[PDB]
């Protein structure tokens with residue numbers, strides 16, 4: 001479906017450290033990030049999205065409109081400027097972040113009460129699965 005609204009709890013997280021390493025996140029912060037519980041909160045109204053990723057320590061919040069490029073500064077992650085764009089490819093929500101890192105972005109598949117997320121950077125893919133709370 002195209003409705004991603006909800007509070008989403010992580011169930012699976014494959015190659016998180018490889019994806020973070022591809023982004024040049026410090027080895028110490030990677031250490032901590034792998035241990036934290038991650039909660040993904042999505043507020044969606046039409047083409048307007050507010051996405052909030054929260055853990056004990058760090059937060060990552062982004063707002064966007066589908067189909068409208070936006071400048072992004074990944075202040076709480078790898079601290080880079082990217083030109084981001086989120087679009088629908090069928091019922092897959094696709095984000096491309098143009099900038100230094102090649103093949104950067106993410107894709108979201110919503111299937112019932114499950115959310116599949118694939119984060120890409122360079123040649124690394126992190127695959128995550130969330131269940132709706």
Ligand SMILES: *C/C=C/c1ccc2c(c1)C(C)(C)c1cc(N(CC)CC)ccc1-2
Pocket residue numbers: 020033036038040051053054055058059060076077106107108117119128
């Ligand atoms: C549709 C989802 C997009 C998206 C953008 C940014 C991040 C995520 C999902 C998370 C939840 C996978 C995530 C986790 C982290 N941490 C360090 C690796 C823990 C807070 C940072 C940024 C994003």
